[PDB]
Write an enzyme that holds these catalytic residues in place. Structure first.
Site: not given
Length: 443
Positions: A14, A97
């Site tokens: 990520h 995110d």
């Protein structure tokens, strides 16, 4: 001056994509504050890296658990400090995110625009947005472990518009649980519930790649914006290399184009020595050149699998290495195939390199990617969970020299071309990012 605070879910898979976006945003005039956890900040060691504790003594479930309650406070404290710092301009926006949903609350409190970045495919997002429905329909959690062998996973999921030929087996596998208080399942249901009609969500994909899925998502989340693939985007970005701050590539230079099979299952997960052995001999037995990135020492009793017998056998065809610049390798003309778990970063990279794949789905969105790779895009084939050398060697040869392989390379190259047209002037992914910056991130 625009100042964006960016924070990714605390895992390399990520952090990497969001970092790439960070570089793009930096080239676009934004003062950047990239927020890593102390753990990730240590490893990595108008563009500032900051760190915050993760509240742990890494295990994904444990991390997610901490992310749901221990990140909001230090995150907001950091925002407060940045806003009162004399060394940097005040924060004007947030690019967070999607898995770091606590940022939504923070954004409301600090009255800041917050654009979410979902790190996986549009399909995975569609799956996550429906985890809640699987529960309400009485499908999950399953009554007991028999769902793993009673054919329950073969059941078709036909109540989710946009999904064409999906089975429970192909859904982001966090639904595979018998626990009603399962951490991952509850984590993602919470993420999905925090998303609404006003939420702007960026996706590392492009319209043509997931057309029906994207159209389906847009009916619930009108502001979903494909801005990828990131590889093609950065590649075609003027001056990208000024933000760029061996033996493998040399080995590959002498190989015939499309003749080498690239193998890299990442480090994030260590496989079984039993599995390790089937891959090694499956690779040796296919008689095709191959570059295998792996650290045998990590696997318990793994280094032993690399016997003197194996080493002599592959002498003229394979090379085992601990690391390699994946981008340059995938794009090397010698590569004819890519063996991977098929996580999203690997999938998009292979697509942008125009390279057919061989998937070995382990968890999360991997089976989801595999289903598209195999049945939708038809640019790859799947390896049995219980890998066996004989069948593996067959699959590899099919991709490298078989007729099915030629067709997959053809479809891969087609996707590669559209991936590139989408990420340069005139392209929708390219235009979408500009629009989000203009209409949302900027005052």
């Amino acid at each position: 001056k625009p100042h964006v605070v960016m924070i990714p879910y605390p895992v390399q898979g990520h952090i990497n994509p969001l970092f790439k976006l960070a570089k793009l945003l930096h080239l676009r005039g934004f003062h950047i504050t990239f927020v890593n956890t102390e753990y990730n900040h240590k490893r990595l060691l108008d563009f500032n890296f900051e760190s915050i504790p993760d509240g742990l003594t890494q295990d994904v479930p444990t991390l997610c658990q901490s992310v749901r309650k221990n990140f909001l406070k230090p995150y907001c404290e950091l925002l407060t400090r940045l806003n009162h710092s004399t060394n940097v301009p005040p924060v004007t926006c947030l690019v967070s995110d999607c898995c770091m949903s606590f940022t939504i609350q923070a954004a409301e409190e600090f009255e800041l625009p917050n654009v979410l970045y979902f790190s996986s495919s549009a399909c995975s997002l569609l799956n996550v947005m429906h985890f809640r429905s699987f529960v309400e329909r009485g499908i999950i959690p399953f009554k007991d472990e028999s769902y793993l062998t009673n054919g329950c996973l073969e059941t078709k999921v036909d109540w989710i518009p946009g999904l064409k030929n999906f089975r429970l087996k192909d859904i982001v596998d966090f639904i595979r649980t018998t626990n009603p208080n399962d951490i991952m399942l509850e984590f993602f249901i919470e993420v999905a519930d925090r998303v609404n009609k006003d939420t702007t969500i960026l996706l590392n994909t492009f319209n043509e790649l997931e057309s029906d899925v994207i159209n389906a998502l847009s009916s619930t989340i009108p502001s979903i914006y494909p801005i990828g693939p990131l590889p093609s985007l950065l590649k075609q970005t003027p001056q990208i290399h000024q933000l760029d701050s061996t033996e493998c590539l040399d080995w590959l230079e002498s190989k015939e184009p499309g003749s080498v099979v690239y193998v890299n299952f990442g480090s994030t997960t260590v496989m079984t020595p039993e599995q390790l052995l089937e891959f090694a001999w499956g690779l040796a037995n296919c008689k095709k050149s191959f570059l295998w990135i792996i650290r045998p020492d990590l696997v318990i009793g793994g280094s032993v699998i690399f016997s003197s017998e194996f080493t002599n056998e592959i002498a003229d065809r394979g090379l085992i290495a601990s690391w390699c610049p994946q981008d340059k390798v995938l794009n090397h003309p010698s590569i004819g195939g890519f063996l991977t778990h098929c996580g999203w970063n690997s999938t998009t990279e292979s697509i942008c390199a125009g390279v057919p794949m061989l998937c070995w789905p382990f968890f999360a969105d991997q089976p989801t990617d595999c289903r598209f790779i195999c049945n939708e895009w038809e640019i790859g084939m799947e390896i049995d969970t219980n890998v066996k050398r004989e069948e593996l060697a067959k699959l590899i040869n099919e991709v490298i020299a078989g007729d099915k392989g030629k067709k997959m390379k053809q479809k891969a190259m087609e996707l590669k071309k559209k991936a590139e047209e989408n990420t340069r002037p005139g392209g929708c992914s390219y235009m979408n990012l500009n629009k989000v910056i203009k209409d949302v991130l900027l005052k």
